[PDB]
Design a protein around this ligand. Structure first.
Ligand SMILES: CCCCCCCCCCCCCCCCC[C@@H](O)O[C@H](CO[C@H](O)CCCCCCCCCCCCCCC)COP(=O)(O)OCC[N+](C)(C)C
Ligand SMILES: CCCCCCCC/C=C/CCCCCCCC(=O)OC[C@H](COP(=O)(O)OCCN)OC(=O)CCCCCCC/C=C/CCCCCCCC
Lengths: 69, 83
């Protein structure tokens, strides 16, 4: 029965090791992403949560019929 | 080409006001694209000096800018006097 239907314990052991490594890395990445989201939304100094401002290319830099703009 | 002539005659005989209105509107639409004086109107509009012309600082490399209003350089309005 063992020879026909089942493998040795090492296969399940090392597959468990691989699964545990993947899951632990995913958990750490989730916590890191939450912290990064919090910091980026608080400071606004990252790529995320960038809200539009007025384009400076819309300004007319011409004499304006009055010396003081 | 023959039925539309009869249509035009019937319109002229029954609703002359609408015939005149459509003819005038079509002329007003199509004529301005065929006139050479439209660009003259644009130039006349551009030649009206509403604001003060602010002088440019001389960096010594603008031979196309006059140093005085009566200098030969700069734009000319001599085309406007002959119009
Ligand atoms: C001989 C008498 C004394 C001993 C009697 C022992 C009784 C045992 C027989 C009863 C069957 C046990 C249940 C079967 C469960 C096994 C299913 C599965 O886990 O096994 C697969 C094996 O597949 C087998 O083909 C299972 C086939 C069993 C299906 C039972 C069908 C019986 C139906 C009855 C039909 C009779 C006639 C019908 C007339 C209409 C594994 O696939 P594999 O990916 O390789 O695994 C790798 C492991 N290696 C490396 C060791 C190979
Ligand atoms: C040398 C050839 C001249 C070429 C001139 C251009 C084409 C001239 C013909 C174009 C259409 C002429 C008028 C329409 C055909 C005859 C009128 C007609 O259709 O029936 C009349 C009938 C009115 O009579 P009733 O009120 O119903 O009488 C009730 C009591 N018995 O007309 C109608 O039903 C609808 C009239 C719609 C009028 C259009 C509204 C105003 C538009 C004109 C304004 C300026 C237009 C300029 C823009 C267009 C430029 C191409």
């Amino acid at each position: 029965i063992a020879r026909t239907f089942y493998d040795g314990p090492e296969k399940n052991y090392e597959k468990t090791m691989a699964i545990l490594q993947i899951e632990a890395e995913k958990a750490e990445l989730r916590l890191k992403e939450l912290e990064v989201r919090r910091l980026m939304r608080a400071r606004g100094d990252g790529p995320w949560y960038q809200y539009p401002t007025i384009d400076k290319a819309l300004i007319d830099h011409s004499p304006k019929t009055t010396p003081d703009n | 080409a023959g039925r539309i002539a009869s249509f035009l005659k019937n319109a002229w005989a029954k609703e002359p006001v609408l015939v005149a209105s459509f003819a005038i509107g079509g002329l007003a639409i199509i004529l301005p694209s065929l006139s050479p004086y439209t660009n003259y109107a644009i130039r006349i509009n551009r030649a009206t000096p509403y604001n003060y012309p602010v002088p440019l600082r001389d960096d010594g490399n603008m031979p196309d800018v006059p140093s005085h209003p009566q200098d030969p350089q700069g734009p000319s309005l001599e085309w406007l006097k002959n119009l």
